[PDB]
């Protein structure tokens, strides 16, 4: 049940430093407490790793970069818990401000490895409506059937290679459509875990 985005596994550009399972490991980021008042989160594609382990050394100390990903979200929820998530990968996710000041803060366009909570998830923070977000690659997390969502994403960009600290290809959004609910005497914060695994990564332009 791994949603292979656009039906394309990430591949090596035919014939650059091609790392291996040392960098192609499973980075398990911090968990995020899913509450009822929760609105959502989003992580940029390579910005979520630019300061985490070996991938943070291969990205900053280089000039060109391309890689897929293996985003994998899991929710350690009970059986008396109810709710639903929409886990979608948005190519070229461009964040927009909200004028009653015109341009998004840098903390909101490159949140790091912690993600930025949505301020208006109904409009995906990008003007476009959340109702049509399913046109992107996505997978539902419905606590009554399954609590896992794996998305395989290739490298989607115009140029073959591009910068890794400036241009963030996509953004993994996680939005609760049906809010969390539970009777008294339960874990009031369902944890959400995210695992990343760069697939077929490449690099160029050392130092």
């Amino acid at each position, epitope marked *: 049940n791994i949603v292979l985005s656009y039906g394309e596994w990430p591949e090596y550009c035919p014939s650059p430093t091609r790392p291996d399972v040392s960098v192609n490991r499973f980075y398990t980021l911090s968990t995020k407490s899913w*509450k009822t*008042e929760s609105t959502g989160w989003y992580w940029k594609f390579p910005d979520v790793l630019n300061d985490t382990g070996v991938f943070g050394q291969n990205a900053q100390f280089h000039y060109l970069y391309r890689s897929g990903f293996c985003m994998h979200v899991q929710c350690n929820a009970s059986k008396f818990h109810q709710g639903a998530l929409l886990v979608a990968a948005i190519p070229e996710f461009v964040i927009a401000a909200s004028s009653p000041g015109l341009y998004p803060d840098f903390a909101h366009t490159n949140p790091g490895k912690d993600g930025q909570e949505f301020r208006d998830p109904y409009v995906l923070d990008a003007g476009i409506p959340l109702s049509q977000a399913l046109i992107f690659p996505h997978q539902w997390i419905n606590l009554r059937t399954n609590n896992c969502a794996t998305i395989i994403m290739p490298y989607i960009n115009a140029l073959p290679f591009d910068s890794a600290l400036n241009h963030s290809n996509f953004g993994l959004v996680v939005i609760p459509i049906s809010p969390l609910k*539970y009777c008294n005497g339960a874990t009031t914060e369902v944890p959400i875990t995210l695992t990343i695994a760069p697939l077929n990564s490449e690099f160029s332009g050392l130092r």
Partner: nanobody
Amino acid sequence: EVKLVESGGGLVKPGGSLKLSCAASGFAFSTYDMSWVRQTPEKRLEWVATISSGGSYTYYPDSVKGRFTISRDNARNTLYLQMSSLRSEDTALYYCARGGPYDYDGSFYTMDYWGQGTSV
């Protein structure tokens, strides 16, 4: 049952602070969005303030809009409401109940169960 109880009110000089407690139990006080309603001496219930289901969002009507400061313990099962420099015509039986514009699966318990109401 949804047992809510308000307490912590009384007389105070115009200009100061006087909090209010709405410690409630018998229901999951970690998913419901509560709010505060004031019953003036003219027997006209007016909205006072609200709080989200996790104590992060807040809608303040034109009654205070900068003076009253609501909160939510959410662990000691209590609800706070500040009265910073209350006005002259601000005496009322400040009730507390459920209901909130947040918590998407709302609009069903909109002030379903109420408290008792403490005077000031």
